[PDB]
């Protein structure tokens, strides 16, 4: 019983957090095998950010211009390359704490844990959603760049690159930004919408936990007026297991959310929560371990 | 910027989680040095009204199976301290962090590593309610999961029971609120809001640009309003702990108290504060300074 915003256990990722330094600029890096991944803007001076030509800036930098420290020890860099917006620094030492891992590019609406890090050291962990406009609503201070988001074998899906004038943007671990954003300090995020299939998953969580007072082409007409993402049959199939668990059909739950949108606590929140996936609900409500 | 409910990184606690089985009952234990800690109800079949001493008598060391991953630890001693079982094993946990056992005060927050069969499931941040319950996420099998703060790991909580939807447990010496480890109906006090935490969170909001609620008063005047709305009384100690936030924001603590009184008397009008449509009280002033 109970429902909470739950993050994955962060131990396997803490053992991969190193501190990358280049000139004055120091940020966080991800040490897996004999390679360290970090935002390529580590090579940028303060004046460089306004309009960096990365290839030119990187060419002016050599292997020894990169200080990689794992806790107390300093690793030796024997190679460097740029993959899209991430820097790959080959080191002479495989990380002995490298977990089984994969790199994954998630889709809008999916969630993950962020281990927020400063100077290579963990600060805290929290759960996040990739918004439909490909930002995330996190808690990121200057210095947190390079922290990663992940699901758990660890599937890394996000590296933090920038704080916008109060949401945040970043890349997958191949360095491609999520969204239209570029790693340059110029003003840059379109209309965000609410993740409908996620709100429906959370209403099922509510019913599972005893909170039931609120109990398709038609539904999308309503949701569109309220800046809710349209609900597709793929989304209905995803909610199938929750429906079979609760004995409440999917279109029945949508009918419930319609009235909620027009008329205005559920699981102790006064707003409709859209940062729980259907997999999140099943995971938390059936106690999946790792 | 931004402001999330944030847990502590959990790797040090992950390394201490094991599985403890006694007869049929399996739950989680906490393995530090050569001792495994778990709820004493691991020995109950019973449980409507268990005589714990008499149930313990019927148990020997080999009736306790303790697994740490795939490794089976050998139990060479066992004792009951208050409501927790302490199992002496033949191996000290190599991954033992620097640690303390602490009893936190109502209103302090901690991180809970939820666990099943000795394996981590997830981490989330919690507050000890003024009525000494916690509003957690615990299924059957989660008993023995622990709550902790980090500076050195300070263990403050071990989970024992779900009341007929909130949660109750003990410190790591096994002292529970008024609750006992028996399946009888049990009443928590009326719960109240943690005023000093609400204020800390309003400061957090101002640091992050949410100012719309800024509108003075006296400690005694505010307290009269706090009582009517089931808010914990505010003390000069509380005002003192908010000092650093006041200096950062340049908003006097009693000025923030008046804005909150206004929020308490007028409601929120459908507006939000840090993405919440209610007043959040599970952040301490320390939590706010740490995050910010
Ligand atoms: C971000 O995590 C970070 N930490 C430490 C430092 Br010294 C710099 C950091 O990023 C600042 C940054 C870099 C690039 C940008 C492009 C566009 C807008 C804002 C930024 C900010
Ligand atoms: C608790 O999470 C738990 N996990 C696994 C098992 Br096999 C049993 C568990 O609790 C049973 C229990 C213990 C103490 C109680 C006290 C008061 C009411 C109910 C219980 C239930």
Swiss-Prot record, chain B:
Task: Give the record's subunit note.
Answer: 3CL-PRO exists as monomer and homodimer. Only the homodimer shows catalytic activity. Interacts with host FBXO22; this interaction promotes the proteasomal degradation of nsp5.
What is the covered span of the full protein? 3264 to 3563 of 7096
Organism listed in the record: Severe acute respiratory syndrome coronavirus 2
User: In UniProt terms, what is the effect of altering residue 199 to V?
Assistant: In strain: Zeta/P.2
Reported regulation of activity: Inhibited by pyridone-containing alpha-ketoamides compounds 13a and 13b. In turn, alpha-ketoamide 13b (tert-butyl (1-((S)-1-(((S)-4-(benzylamino)-3,4-dioxo-1-((S)-2-oxopyrrolidin-3-yl)butan-2-yl)amino)-3-cyclopropyl-1-oxopropan-2-yl)-2-oxo-1,2-dihydropyridin-3-yl)carbamate) inhibits SARS-CoV-2 replication in human lung cells. Inhibited ex vivo by michael acceptor inhibitor N3. Inhibited ex vivo by compound 11a and 11b.
Q: Which gene encodes it?
A: rep
The protein in question is named 3C-like proteinase nsp5
Q: Where found?
A: Host cytoplasm; Host Golgi apparatus; Host nucleus
User: Which reaction is catalysed here?
Assistant: TSAVLQ-|-SGFRK-NH2 and SGVTFQ-|-GKFKK the two peptides corresponding to the two self-cleavage sites of the SARS 3C-like proteinase are the two most reactive peptide substrates. The enzyme exhibits a strong preference for substrates containing Gln at P1 position and Leu at P2 position
Q: Where is this cross-link: Glycyl lysine isopeptide (Lys-Gly) (interchain with G-Cter in ubiquitin)?
A: 5, 88
| Peptidase C30 domain ranges (all copies) | 1-292
Which residue positions are annotated as catalytic? 41 (for 3cl-pro activity), 143 (nucleophile)
């Amino acid at each position: 019983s109970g429902f909470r915003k739950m993050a994955f256990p962060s131990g396997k990722v803490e053992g991969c957090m190193v501190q990358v330094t280049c000139g004055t600029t120091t940020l966080n890096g991800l040490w897996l095998d004999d390679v360290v991944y970090c935002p390529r803007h580590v090579i940028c001076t303060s004046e460089d950010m306004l309009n960096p030509n990365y290839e030119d800036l990187l060419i002016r930098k050599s292997n020894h211009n990169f200080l990689v420290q794992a806790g107390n020890v300093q690793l030796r860099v024997i190679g460097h390359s740029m993959q899209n917006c991430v820097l790959k620094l080959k080191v002479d030492t495989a990380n002995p704490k490298t977990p089984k891992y994969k790199f994954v590019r998630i889709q809008p609406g999916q969630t993950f844990s962020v281990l927020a890090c400063y100077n290579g050291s963990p600060s805290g962990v929290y759960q996040c959603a990739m918004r439909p406009n490909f930002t995330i609503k996190g808690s990121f201070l200057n210095g947190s760049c390079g922290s990663v988001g992940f699901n758990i074998c660890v599937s890394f899906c996000y590296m933090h690159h920038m704080e916008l004038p109060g949401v945040h943007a970043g890349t997958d671990l191949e360095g491609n930004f999520y969204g239209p954003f570029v790693d340059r300090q110029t003003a840059q995020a379109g209309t965000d919408t609410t993740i409908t299939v996620n709100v429906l998953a959370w209403l099922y969580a509510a019913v599972i936990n005893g909170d039931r007072w609120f109990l398709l082409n038609d539904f999308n007409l309503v949701a569109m007026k309220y800046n809710y993402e349209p609900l597709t049959q793929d989304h209905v199939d995803i909610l199938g297991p929750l429906s079979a668990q609760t004995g409440i059909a999917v279109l029945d739950m949508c009918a419930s959310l319609k009235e909620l949108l027009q008329n205005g606590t559920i699981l102790g929140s006064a707003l409709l929560e859209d940062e729980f996936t259907p997999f999140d609900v099943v995971r938390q409500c059936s106690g999946v371990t790792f």
